[PDB]
Each structure stands twice: as structure tokens, then as C-alpha cells.
Amino acid sequence: XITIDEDLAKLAKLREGMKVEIVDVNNGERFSTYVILGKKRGEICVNGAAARKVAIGDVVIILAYASMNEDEINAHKPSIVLVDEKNEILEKGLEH
Amino acid sequence: XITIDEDLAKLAKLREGMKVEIVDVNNGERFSTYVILGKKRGEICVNGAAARKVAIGDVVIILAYASMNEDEINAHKPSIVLVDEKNEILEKGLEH
Amino acid sequence: XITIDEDLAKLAKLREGMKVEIVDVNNGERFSTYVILGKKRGEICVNGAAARKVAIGDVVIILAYASMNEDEINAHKPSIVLVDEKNEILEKGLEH
């Protein structure tokens, strides 16, 4: 794979090659792939076999998980980014 | 995502943001998501794309796994919580 | 499972018994299995229950993931191998 606007990825602290879970709100498909930093603004392109799990225009949720110990958990603060129909940032909270 | 009664989550030692496996007994669906601490008593709400994998009223099993070394395994004791139709606690065993 | 030409596996730094994700471009199936080093040149054989998820002749993508810390991530360089219809190496890049 999934090419994500490098500027959008950065806000979500995603690294290129980082495994992410993709869930499609339109069709309910859930799959895993890895991040590819895009150069096109507002771009979210699904590449490879995963293309068969989505349709252009679908709304998706991209999630990144990390393995943490108890101390990391207590000090941890997730980066939750919300975007608009143009994949432009609307909000970026550090809490649920 | 899954919003779980914070009081119920605590009994299962679930932390907010903790990845959990959800298995639906009614339809057999199996998926992963993360925990959101709820404020409503006895509430278990599936949010996002996962809503398409369940029906309100379905019976589900929520599981949390942790990566342990051999010593942790030997000293480990799982928290198994059983609830009633109202998601009220019935039992909480520390063994299978 | 998946038996991979040991010579091809080596180029992708795959070890025997290493868990890998398989995604079938033809049918969109996505599953996990482990690597078995093959002795036959250009061979890619799917064994076990996974045989039902593919058809001989399908194009697939084999991926290996590793759990890394921040330092490992910064110094990390993925091995991306591209092959031809005969599973002969075409390219092996160290970047996306």
C-alpha cells in the first residue's frame, strides 16, 4: 503493497516497509500488507494481490501495531489520524 | 474497534489499545481488532469495518495473547472470564 | 508448506522453517505457511491444506517479515527479488 502519501504516513509515524493492517469499511475485507511511501499528495494506492480486496473509492482504516512491554504500554500514546475524503488531515489525536 | 465495559476489561486485564482476537460463535467469523474502554455497563460494541463481521446479539469470545519466554510460561496464569447474557461476570478462573 | 528452490530462497534470505506470507495475484488468496528448501531448480510447490488456496501456474508474492527495534529499522535494507515466468532471478534490489 500500500502506497501512502509520505506526508500522511509521517503523521501516523509509519515507516516504509512497516507491516500494517488494512480494513475496508465498504466491503469488510481485512488484510495485512506493508507501507510504501508515496510521492503523490493525498494518494492511497493498493498494489499487488490486495487490489482484489478493495475498490477505488472505498473508505479504509490503516492500523499499525507494536509489541510493547508493560512500561512501554503505560507511557505509550497512540497516533490517531483522521482524514477527509481527499485524504487531507482533519485531526491527529494522541488518545482514543 | 471493540468497546468493552472498562470494568469487564479490567477483570480480563485488557489495556486500552491492546490487540485482541474476536471469534463469533454464531457465524464463525474470526478477526483481530483493539480494545477501547467503555463507560457503559455491560456494553460490548463492535466499531468500524468489523461491524460487518457480527450481528448485535451474537455470542463472542474475546482473546488476548502475549509473547512469553519459557520462564514466563511456567509462572503464567491466564485470566479466564465467563459472563452471562448481560455481560455480567459469572466466573473468573486462573486456569483452563 | 511451500517448497522453494533453495537457490531462490537464499537470495531472499529465507531460512528453512521461516514463516512467510503468501499472496496469490490470480485469485487474491492470502495465507501464511513456512519455507521448505527445494532441490529442484525453479521449483515453487505448495504443500498441504494450502494447495486448496492456489492453482498451478498462479503468480504469487512471497513475503518475510521480521520484528525490529528502531535502530534495526534505520539500518535495515529489505531484499526484494523479482523473477521471471520460470522463477529465474531478474532483479534483487535492496530498496523499494
Binding site: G42, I44, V46, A51, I56, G57, L63 | - | -
Partner: peptide, 24 residues
């Protein structure tokens, strides 16, 4: 002992393109 925890998420983004036969 470690647990997989939600690190980050991009909520409700729109897929702008798809490439089945992508190369790279």
C-alpha cells in the same frame, strides 16, 4: 512479556488507486 498494542492508525482514508500487477 510483550503485547501487540495499537501504535497508530489512519482513520477512514480513501483508496485513490489500485494496481493488481504492480512491480516493485
Amino acid at each position: 512479556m510483550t503485547f501487540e498494542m495499537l501504535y497508530s492508525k489512519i482513520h477512514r482514508a480513501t483508496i485513490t488507486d489500485a494496481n493488481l500487477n504492480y512491480i516493485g
